[PDB]
User: What shape does this take?
Amino acid sequence: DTLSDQLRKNYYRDLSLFDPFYHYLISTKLATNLNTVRKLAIKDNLDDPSSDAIDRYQKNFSRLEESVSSISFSKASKLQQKYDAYQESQK
Amino acid sequence: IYTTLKFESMMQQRVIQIRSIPEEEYHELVSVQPIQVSVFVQSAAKVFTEFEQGCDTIGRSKVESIYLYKFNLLQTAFFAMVSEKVNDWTQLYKDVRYLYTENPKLLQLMELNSRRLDLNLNLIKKTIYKLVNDQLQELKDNERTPDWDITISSLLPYLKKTALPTLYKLEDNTILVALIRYIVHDLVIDNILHWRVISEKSSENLSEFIMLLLSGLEIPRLNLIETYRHSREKLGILSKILTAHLKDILEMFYEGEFFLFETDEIVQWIILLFADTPTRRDCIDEIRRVREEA
Amino acid sequence: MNPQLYLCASVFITRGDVKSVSEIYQGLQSDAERLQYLKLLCVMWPELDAPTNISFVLKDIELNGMDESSVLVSLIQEDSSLTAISEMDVNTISKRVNALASYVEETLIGFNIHIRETHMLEDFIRARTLVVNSLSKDALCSLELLANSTSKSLVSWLDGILKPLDHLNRRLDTKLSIFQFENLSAQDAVSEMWKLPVKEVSVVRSMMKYEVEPYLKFQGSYTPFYEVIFNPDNFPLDSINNFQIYKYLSSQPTPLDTKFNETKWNILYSNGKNLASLPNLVFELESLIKSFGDDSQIFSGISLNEWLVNLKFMNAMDIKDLKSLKKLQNEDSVVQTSYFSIITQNMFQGHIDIKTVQNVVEFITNELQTSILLESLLKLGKFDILEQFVSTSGVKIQDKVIIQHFWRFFNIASNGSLSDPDMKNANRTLNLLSNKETHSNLYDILTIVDRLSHYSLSFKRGMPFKPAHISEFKANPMEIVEKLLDLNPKLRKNIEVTFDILKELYTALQVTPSDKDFTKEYSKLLSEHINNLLANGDFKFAFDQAINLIERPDAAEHWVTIFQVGKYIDPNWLDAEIPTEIIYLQLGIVSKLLHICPEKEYEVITSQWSGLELELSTRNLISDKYS
Assistant: This one.
């Protein structure tokens, strides 16, 4: 809960500081951090099958994962559209 | 209460003088007339002269009512003390008769003294009364084996070396007659008459005893007094009654030998010693009857 | 770096692509390009990724001679998403590079870290550790990277900062970051460590070993320890736990600073009074004092050895602190004499050996101290040890002290018997006198009081006669003999024994008799026997003694007792009549009394004589009923 709130606070702060490239990097970095927490929760449930670490993970991070996935997709799509428009202008 | 004031206080001046009669006067003897008195007797004359002397300081009339109380009391006071200071009461008695010879006003003093003597006589009588019945009592319990000791160690030595030599010191031959008479009449013979019986054997025991009594009651200076010889003759006759068979007994009566025996006494002496027979009868009625005719 | 390569690299870095980021790093030809790349890697690598994934920067660089252009070409070929990032106009590429470079530099400045070209890997590991710790709050989050470093500076930082902070955070459930802890003052950091939930020796030992000692060793100063922890305010010495923590900290071999020993002393000297409020205090003080070493300057002019000697006597002085012990040196000679006399009296209580005396000699006016020692042995009835000590040392007790202790034992004694413990102690006390003849009367007092204890004697009705009461009869010793005659019927005929008791009483009480032969006292004694015999029906023996009394030079003073014999009437006589024999005896004594009595009494004495003579004249001396 403390880690989810600190990740959420840092993420929305860093998104508010500012080309879609910056927000693409910030969302990619957070997606990698969330993947490390996911892997840790999976490992804990493998080491102790009675652990609720996967359920705690889903409860605390699911909305943040969805938000990051949506922003990462949007910014990756805007990066590609700017590039395709640039290529057609050069042609 | 003024007169009372002085009378008790001069009572003090003579008493101081009496305590002051020098102590060595009650032990030393002076020659005086013949009697010998102690050195203090003559000094003593002054104290009772001095009581009359002290009376002048308000005389009689002012003194008449207690004088006899006060005089007799002083005579009594002096008398008591000198007994403890003058050891030998017989030495003591002689001094006191001599003082009330010198001044015949010491009335109580002679009463005290004569009674002092009566006592000393009774002391002599009591000690002697005890021994005689007891020896006689001793004879009484063991006819067969009398203890002659009662007589031997105490009674006669008392008389010869104690009782009698004491009586010589007092010098008054009328009185010795009263003492010898006491032992013979009131002591020895009377108890003897009052036994239930005088056993045939007891009489000889008794015969050994009395004679021993005569031996110690012989006072040669008195062969001159009538009852002294009558007592000794009588006792001499009493032992003789005690050891004879009946025939010698009537023989005596007729001989006047019962001069010192009442018919009452003669028959009673007959009644006590021998058993009832005409023999005792002819003799007894003979004595009372020859005594009857006389 | 090439602007296009720097932008492509930032995408692989943020993706945690270990392969692409390691290949780009090995392709960098200049230290300036590597510095720019390591700044980017430090800030943009995902904080939660495994520290081992960036460990390739710690490997030696194999200069494979790949040109930046060839690496850029392959990366754009493999990932078409990089085309929109790297193939823009020059102004857009410069804007992207400047925005990213500003963000990276602002982030590093926010931690007060500058990565230097001369120390690039060391400063990178420190920077990366602060960046990761800002998120995770784990102070050991980069331990795997630090363990692979040969830098002594990083090892000292791990041991002095990271390990202390990790232990502090785990102990207090605090989440203090490395950057926050490094920006604390050394006093504030030690103050945070000194926050203990429970102050026990075990907890303090763990905090000292894993937090404070490594931190102060890294800071290069122990001053924060004495200022914040080891001071009089934290060590009131008012509890066993506080005292044991003080003992434990006082034994730490670091720090070797004079300020440590001063502060250790200031705690003990200021707060040591509270120690009076431990199995053996003297042993704990002895162990602590031995741990200073032999440095006399600390001890206000008393040597270590002198403190150790003085500590042995703290219990005998009833002194429980070093400051009160030092204060005794400033006390006056009378107070010092009193304390030294208490020491010797306390040390010599119970059974003692010669070593106990030798310890007092090693500790050491000596004459006054020895007097208090001897007075304490006397006080406690230790006569066997006193006799042994006096015979061996040649020391004499003052006769005044001996006489004072004699009266103390004599006045406490329950009865006069020499079997009584206090009468034994009084007798033993007199045997210490150097001159028995000068005090003969004290032995006479012991002797007569023992003799009196063999008789029935009471001081007052229902109060037993004590030895102490004999002094009350000094004005009239005859009153003891009067009480003896009343209470002991066997004494009434034993004039020799009561006269011997009277002579012993006069001797013991220092009463002067009338003459050398006790003439008046014997006449009075004989008078008291006659009075007691008449009161008990023994007319014979009363009369025999009244004949002895009447022949005495002073018999006139006793005329009343002689007159009482002359008027005596026994209510048990037959018909209540005087026996005739007794009348002659009473006449007997009354007219001897007429020769010596006061002239004023002649009438009364003569009236008794005439009454007895008249009574005698009424008796039939031949048949005397009353003989």
